[PDB]
Design a protein around this motif. Structure first.
Motif, PDB file in Angstrom:
ATOM      1  N   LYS A 107      18.681  20.577  25.680  1.00 46.76           N
ATOM      2  CA  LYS A 107      19.076  20.578  24.270  1.00 46.76           C
ATOM      3  C   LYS A 107      20.352  20.326  24.287  1.00 46.76           C
ATOM      4  CE  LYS A 107      16.334  20.901  21.928  1.00 46.76           C
ATOM      5  NZ  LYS A 107      14.742  20.045  21.477  1.00 46.76           N
ATOM      6  N   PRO A 108      20.974  19.928  22.847  1.00 47.53           N
ATOM      7  CA  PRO A 108      22.329  19.625  22.827  1.00 47.53           C
ATOM      8  C   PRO A 108      23.163  20.759  23.460  1.00 47.53           C
ATOM      9  CG  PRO A 108      21.621  18.654  21.119  1.00 47.53           C
ATOM     10  CD  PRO A 108      20.288  19.486  21.860  1.00 47.53           C
ATOM     11  N   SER A 109      24.273  20.482  24.340  1.00 45.17           N
ATOM     12  CA  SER A 109      25.179  21.316  25.249  1.00 45.17           C
ATOM     13  C   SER A 109      26.010  21.936  24.140  1.00 45.17           C
ATOM     14  CB  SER A 109      26.057  20.609  26.066  1.00 45.17           C
ATOM     15  OG  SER A 109      25.170  20.300  27.206  1.00 45.17           O
ATOM     16  N   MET A 110      26.609  23.428  24.429  1.00 41.63           N
ATOM     17  CA  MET A 110      27.548  24.109  23.708  1.00 41.63           C
ATOM     18  C   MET A 110      28.755  23.408  23.736  1.00 41.63           C
ATOM     19  SD  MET A 110      27.068  27.984  25.082  1.00 41.63           S
ATOM     20  CE  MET A 110      27.309  27.476  26.847  1.00 41.63           C
ATOM     21  N   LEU A 111      29.610  23.625  22.591  1.00 37.82           N
ATOM     22  CA  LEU A 111      30.999  22.783  22.482  1.00 37.82           C
ATOM     23  C   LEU A 111      31.974  23.434  23.660  1.00 37.82           C
ATOM     24  CD1 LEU A 111      31.062  23.159  18.787  1.00 37.82           C
ATOM     25  CD2 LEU A 111      30.851  21.235  20.097  1.00 37.82           C
ATOM     26  N   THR A 112      31.878  24.650  24.169  1.00 41.81           N
ATOM     27  CA  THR A 112      32.718  25.132  25.200  1.00 41.81           C
ATOM     28  C   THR A 112      31.743  25.867  26.255  1.00 41.81           C
ATOM     29  OG1 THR A 112      34.401  25.792  23.468  1.00 41.81           O
ATOM     30  CG2 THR A 112      34.585  26.927  25.805  1.00 41.81           C
ATOM     31  N   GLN A 113      32.070  25.511  27.427  1.00 37.47           N
ATOM     32  CA  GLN A 113      31.487  25.917  28.581  1.00 37.47           C
ATOM     33  C   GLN A 113      31.610  27.341  28.686  1.00 37.47           C
ATOM     34  OE1 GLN A 113      34.281  23.488  30.381  1.00 37.47           O
ATOM     35  NE2 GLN A 113      33.787  24.484  32.435  1.00 37.47           N
ATOM     36  N   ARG A 114      30.835  28.263  29.070  1.00 34.77           N
ATOM     37  CA  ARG A 114      30.865  29.848  29.291  1.00 34.77           C
ATOM     38  C   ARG A 114      29.863  30.437  30.131  1.00 34.77           C
ATOM     39  NH1 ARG A 114      32.000  31.157  23.674  1.00 34.77           N
ATOM     40  NH2 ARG A 114      32.082  29.178  22.872  1.00 34.77           N
ATOM     41  N   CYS A 115      30.426  31.406  30.956  1.00 35.07           N
ATOM     42  CA  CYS A 115      29.527  32.588  31.639  1.00 35.07           C
ATOM     43  C   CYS A 115      29.751  33.893  31.123  1.00 35.07           C
ATOM     44  CB  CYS A 115      29.891  32.674  33.123  1.00 35.07           C
ATOM     45  SG  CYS A 115      29.615  31.210  34.073  1.00 35.07           S
ATOM     46  N   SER A 116      28.796  34.651  31.213  1.00 33.46           N
ATOM     47  CA  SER A 116      29.063  36.121  30.888  1.00 33.46           C
ATOM     48  C   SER A 116      29.241  36.302  29.299  1.00 33.46           C
ATOM     49  CB  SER A 116      30.165  36.933  31.365  1.00 33.46           C
ATOM     50  OG  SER A 116      29.736  36.596  33.134  1.00 33.46           O
ATOM     51  N   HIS A 117      28.849  35.376  28.558  1.00 31.73           N
ATOM     52  CA  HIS A 117      28.823  35.549  26.996  1.00 31.73           C
ATOM     53  C   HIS A 117      27.788  36.210  26.411  1.00 31.73           C
ATOM     54  CE1 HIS A 117      26.600  32.136  28.554  1.00 31.73           C
ATOM     55  NE2 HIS A 117      25.810  31.774  27.423  1.00 31.73           N
ATOM     56  N   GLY A 118      27.624  36.442  25.434  1.00 32.34           N
ATOM     57  CA  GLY A 118      26.902  36.945  24.425  1.00 32.34           C
ATOM     58  C   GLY A 118      25.924  35.835  23.673  1.00 32.34           C
ATOM     59  N   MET A 119      24.692  35.960  23.455  1.00 36.15           N
ATOM     60  CA  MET A 119      23.922  35.073  22.859  1.00 36.15           C
ATOM     61  C   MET A 119      22.920  35.845  22.057  1.00 36.15           C
ATOM     62  SD  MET A 119      22.351  31.176  23.546  1.00 36.15           S
ATOM     63  CE  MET A 119      21.225  31.770  24.603  1.00 36.15           C
ATOM     64  N   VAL A 120      22.843  35.467  20.615  1.00 30.79           N
ATOM     65  CA  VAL A 120      21.851  36.344  19.924  1.00 30.79           C
ATOM     66  C   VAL A 120      21.310  35.321  18.947  1.00 30.79           C
ATOM     67  CG1 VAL A 120      23.665  37.141  18.165  1.00 30.79           C
ATOM     68  CG2 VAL A 120      21.319  38.488  18.561  1.00 30.79           C
ATOM     69  N   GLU A 121      19.975  35.681  18.471  1.00 34.09           N
ATOM     70  CA  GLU A 121      19.432  35.007  17.274  1.00 34.09           C
ATOM     71  C   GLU A 121      19.501  35.833  16.003  1.00 34.09           C
ATOM     72  OE1 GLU A 121      16.472  36.250  15.488  1.00 34.09           O
ATOM     73  OE2 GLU A 121      16.255  34.514  14.211  1.00 34.09           O
ATOM     74  N   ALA A 122      19.684  35.095  14.737  1.00 33.77           N
ATOM     75  CA  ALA A 122      20.073  35.495  13.664  1.00 33.77           C
ATOM     76  C   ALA A 122      19.581  34.766  12.351  1.00 33.77           C
ATOM     77  CB  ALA A 122      21.418  36.173  13.357  1.00 33.77           C
ATOM     78  N   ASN A 123      18.434  34.938  11.893  1.00 29.12           N
ATOM     79  CA  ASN A 123      17.993  34.368  10.594  1.00 29.12           C
ATOM     80  C   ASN A 123      17.777  32.764  11.272  1.00 29.12           C
ATOM     81  OD1 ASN A 123      18.627  36.463   8.730  1.00 29.12           O
ATOM     82  ND2 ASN A 123      20.916  35.829   8.859  1.00 29.12           N
ATOM     83  N   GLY A 124      17.236  32.693  12.237  1.00 30.27           N
ATOM     84  CA  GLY A 124      16.649  31.183  12.811  1.00 30.27           C
ATOM     85  C   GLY A 124      17.940  30.672  13.621  1.00 30.27           C
ATOM     86  N   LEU A 125      19.099  30.845  13.480  1.00 28.56           N
ATOM     87  CA  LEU A 125      20.247  30.262  14.095  1.00 28.56           C
ATOM     88  C   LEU A 125      20.739  31.081  15.363  1.00 28.56           C
ATOM     89  CD1 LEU A 125      22.477  29.455  10.972  1.00 28.56           C
ATOM     90  CD2 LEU A 125      20.642  28.226  12.281  1.00 28.56           C
TER      91      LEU A 125
END
Length: 288
Positions: free
Chosen positions: A124-142
């Protein structure tokens, strides 16, 4: 109807994978026949915990799956690009994986998802900023990402930036940055807010806590945790955020922490010990 647990995964030693039950404060063993992974990620969708990424002697290419209702394990092929310190979440039957590091790269922009219906992986389309050890969460479909790091511990840096991916538009949008740069922080969605909990940055560990107001596109500080360390393993059930493990820097979190999002009050629960495997994977499961 619903029956929530917080599941912690820490390898194949006795008591190294367990459910925490917020209703009665109990810990219950989960049998796991797979050895600990270094710097992997986990995600829950439709009765299955997916464990993906990370390494042992080499990068792991398999995804291990735990069916919570059947109490059984199975394996699929994991992300197309094996990597450590990636983040994962689920939205509408897809498992998303972002960022992380391979050998020869401090941090990636990569975004790959697994369609649980067709059992296939898609870039899928890549993030705007590369990152490790970040958080990622779903909220209301986003799908929201914040913090993490890029580069090494000498010339690299920990990020405050936040961005959001909308599966409908397949677009990443830059959001208001966090007040604090953070990696290894908790990141949980409660009601209409995304709480970033602790973690660490280039200047040390963090006891502080902030949330993202989705409606206002602003981050705001709330009350700090009673414990200051460098990593936290966090999950929310209902209106309460539970910190169930964490690495301090020298030792570990000894007893669990509980945050009431409605009253902005933290307590350390002196009757409930924290999980001793500080590098565990953590996710919220429904056992129904």
């Amino acid at each position: 109807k619903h029956d929530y647990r917080i599941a912690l995964f820490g390898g194949s030693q006795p008591q190294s994978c367990r459910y925490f039950n917020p209703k009665d404060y109990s810990w219950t063993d989960i049998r796991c026949p797979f050895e600990k992974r270094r710097d992997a990620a986990c995600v829950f969708w439709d009765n299955v915990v997916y464990i993906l990424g990370g390494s042992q002697l080499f990068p792991i290419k398999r995804m291990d799956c735990y069916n919570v209702v059947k109490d059984s394990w199975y394996s699929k092929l994991g992300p197309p690009t094996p990597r450590d310190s990636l983040a994962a979440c689920a939205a509408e039957g897809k498992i998303y994986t972002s960022g992380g590091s391979e050998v020869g790269n401090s941090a990636l922009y990569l975004f790959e998802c697994y369609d649980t219906r067709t059992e296939s992986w898609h870039t899928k389309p890549s993030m705007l900023t590369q990152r490790c050890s970040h958080g990622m969460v779903e909220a209301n479909g986003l799908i929201y990402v914040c913090g993490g790091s890029l580069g090494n511990n000498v010339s690299g840096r920990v990020l405050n930036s936040c961005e959001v991916y909308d599966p409908a538009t397949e677009t990443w949008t830059e959001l208001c940055p966090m007040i604090e740069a953070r990696k290894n922080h908790g990141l949980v969605f409660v009601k209409d807010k995304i709480f970033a909990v602790g973690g660490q940055n280039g200047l040390g560990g963090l006891d502080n806590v902030e949330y993202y107001d989705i409606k206002l596109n602003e981050w705001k500080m709330v009350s700090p945790m009673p414990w200051k360390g460098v990593t936290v393993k966090c999950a929310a059930v209902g209106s309460i955020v539970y910190v169930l493990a964490g690495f301090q820097g020298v030792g570990r979190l000894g007893h669990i922490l509980e945050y009431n999002t409605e009253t902005d009050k933290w307590v350390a629960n002196s009757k409930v010990r924290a999980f001793p495997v500080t590098s565990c994977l953590i996710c919220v499961v429904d056992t129904c």
